[PDB]
Design a protein around this ligand. Structure first.
Ligand SMILES: *C[C@@H]1C(=O)O[C@@H]2[C@@H]1CCC(=C)[C@@H]1CCC(=C)[C@H]21
Ligand SMILES: *C[C@@H]1C(=O)O[C@@H]2[C@H]1CCC(=C)[C@@H]1CCC(=C)[C@@H]21
Ligand SMILES: *C[C@H]1C(=O)O[C@H]2[C@@H]1CCC(=C)[C@@H]1CCC(=C)[C@H]21
Ligand SMILES: O=S([O-])[O-]
Ligand SMILES: [Mn+2]
Lengths: 232, 246, 244, 245
């Protein structure tokens, strides 16, 4: 006798192309059920994915959210997708490699507002500031940028914002000469997890992003160091 | 640029937990201790977090969790922060026909936050239950489709609530409860009662939410239910949220 | 001064394109584990080679192409022994039983290739299926059923499309799995499960039977897990036959 | 057809473990109990498997592990079977210089197998350690490039405490791990790990020497993953050795 804000499918694995790049994405498609209805065409959620096509595009994602709301005869819902994203970048001096970043594109239709969010987990390098000054500790960190979008924003732009405010970016292949630069860059710029977040937010604190949730996790100890800063 | 959450993550440490009855259960809790850093400050004492779990000695009780939050806040010289411990819980149960005593696993998460001098204490429990699809017993001459289900109950608490009391609500409001040890009688009463009580992922959350609304000890809750479909590799999901003050 | 059996990279995730049994192409993302062997004398390996080899490659991975990659590494890494492993999600167009509506199903496919003094090639298939206990029906109107995982690791003597192992498993379970199933189709899947109930042992035995008959599988290890719906524990059954 | 392993999987049931000193430790383990099914009999009694865990008393010692193993063989009426449990283990360590203490998390998988009258018993430990680069340090003017996991699955010839298996990995690495660390303790770990850089290739060989010596261990499978901090992949190394050969 009460409304179920999210009713739907979860963990739907089905291929997906983005732009071009073919990946595989896991879907979480859901709709809101009113207080008087009792069921939903969960089969339609599958039929959508299995029939939809085209490179996913800001516009194709917005249309896919709309088609769902009709196919399911609904007024609110969300389309969530988690897929691997790669980027062919160049070495700092070598000229050479592809890196894996996990992206999450989410779009909800509530109160006549189709809000498009996007998140990317980026591998980045960090170096302790206390050590070095304390002594005569360069682990890897995971930066998560969940950005509420006011206008279209590429994921590689967000990836660039994170790798550009860190002791060092990550490269799959790094010739031995490059290793020096990457290793010596941290020695110069000791980055405290407490600071990397502050610095990263400043780049988003950007108008294509009205709101965001940015988290930095360092893999020190067998524990971890985590900082999150939300906004509006 | 203030930092809303700054602390440690993924600290594992043994833990003692006290039940509704005079039973204390020893578990392993992975802790995530965090605080708030304003713009005036520019760094926190990470080591202090790790010290409070080692320093403390006792059975995590509803009052011991409160003191911990404050303790942490003072030991770091802050006025806001959060504490989350994820531990595995267990309850001895009597099988439906046998009465055989078997232990069932439960995933409990104790969280507590302080913001603006207000301490919201929340409790999430992952409850394993059985689901039987309603349009399978009426669409088919013989049989029905059954899967395992995950019922998650995150609840802001206005009062102490036993985690077993949250398990008792959901297990009662489902097609059939889970038991580790069952024999031929046990597995007969189980199968038949579930066919007799078929429910949707849509129905499950509603039945539970109503029992939740009869508990004034829970001011707010976020209910969730996943059905690991037997006929599909995908799962089904339903979610309900409620701030009773609105 | 000790032979390090296999040293190399692990968890290298890289995009891959694989030709199917139909000749068609399947683009998936696979995580790679490329390693080499260090004799008692050699003390170090140029780890960077593995990474390069992956990105500087080209061509849809094939039975012949995969064997070639193992050979190329052995030269790029100055080695006589190495192992290359790729684990990737794979999909097939499964058509519904009664409505004929087609839909894709997920299958984790792991491909292992080893070249140690004889190049042994393997294939792993994870078949999700429905299980039904044969002792819930006889104990009236009612059965306990759930999802199951059939794992088939097979050493290849000739080319064997994974699709040839899925069918067997899907056919040897009480019911196969479908993503898009309409009301007419959700009744044949709920009935045949009652009709063809099967224990975890009754299942594994039925599957391994055609594996030793496939004759292109030199060896195999078959697993099956029932994610029981009446317990929080999973039923298991593993059978290992070499026949060599 | 005969099936080698048939049984339960992923049963969570609290357990108590014996520490070297003799003290006890409470943990929660995931038990995987399985048997060998002959072509003669179609049905195992799976239930019993859960009954054997609930009907248990006291700490998992070396004799209690073999007792359980056997007791389950008689309750299930079989001639072969395996029992595996994986539990978190903790050790009250001492910070290098300040003496502040901290518990460290270790993953211990205890395997036991009766087959053909011979009861084999194995022990696996994952030890969280630090590694540094015997290539980045010198080649670079300043700075060093991560945490690693060392896994030692050892076939035991006699009763061996897991802490002794933990000691070999923590000592033959660059540095060990600590939960709580002071300022004087964080300066010794940064230099002494840098002063003693060891490769993944160098890490595994150094441990095996000690393993090859301990006559308590007849066979072992040694693994090492360095979880690279400059890269999105990890380094792997494996050693295999049944001295009886
Ligand atoms: C240690 C040496 C280095 O400078 O960084 C490393 C390399 C060996 C091992 C490893 C962690 C990486 C693989 C390629 C490489 C350049 C990285
Ligand atoms: C009973 C009905 C059915 O047969 O199909 C199932 C089930 C409803 C819930 C759910 C587990 C399934 C998702 C899609 C599907 C068709 C549903
Ligand atoms: C036939 C099953 C039943 O009714 O309950 C049992 C039988 C075996 C299959 C099933 C998945 C489980 C595991 C163990 C158990 C007692 C349960
Ligand atoms: O490095 S700090 O967490 O002691
Ligand atoms: Mn530090």
């Amino acid at each position: 006798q009460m409304p179920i804000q999210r009713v739907g499918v979860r963990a739907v694995r089905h291929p997906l192309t983005v732009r071009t790049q073919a990946t595989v994405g896991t879907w979480n498609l859901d709709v809101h059920l009113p207080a008087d209805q009792k069921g939903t065409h969960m089969s339609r959620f599958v039929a959508l994915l299995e029939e939809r096509g085209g490179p996913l595009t800001a516009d194709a994602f917005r249309t896919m959210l709309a088609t769902m709301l009709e196919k399911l005869e609904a007024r609110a819902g969300r389309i969530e997708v988690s897929f691997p994203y790669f980027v062919n970048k160049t070495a700092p001096v070598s000229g050479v490699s592809l890196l894996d970043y996990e992206v999450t594109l989410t779009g909800d239709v509530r109160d006549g507002l189709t809000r498009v969010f996007a998140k990317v987990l980026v591998p980045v390098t960090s170096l302790c500031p206390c050590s070095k000054k304390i002594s005569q500790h360069n682990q890897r960190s995971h930066v998560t940028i969940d950005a509420e979008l006011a206008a279209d924003v590429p994921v590689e732009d967000l990836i660039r914002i994170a790798e550009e405010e860190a002791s060092c970016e990550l490269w799959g292949l790094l010739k031995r000469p490059d290793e020096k630069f990457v290793t010596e860059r941290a020695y110069e710029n000791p980055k405290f997890v407490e600071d990397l977040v502050r610095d990263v937010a400043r780049r988003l604190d950007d108008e294509r992003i009205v709101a965001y949730v940015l988290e930095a996790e360092n893999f020190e100890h067998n524990h971890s160091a985590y900082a999150l800063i939300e906004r509006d």
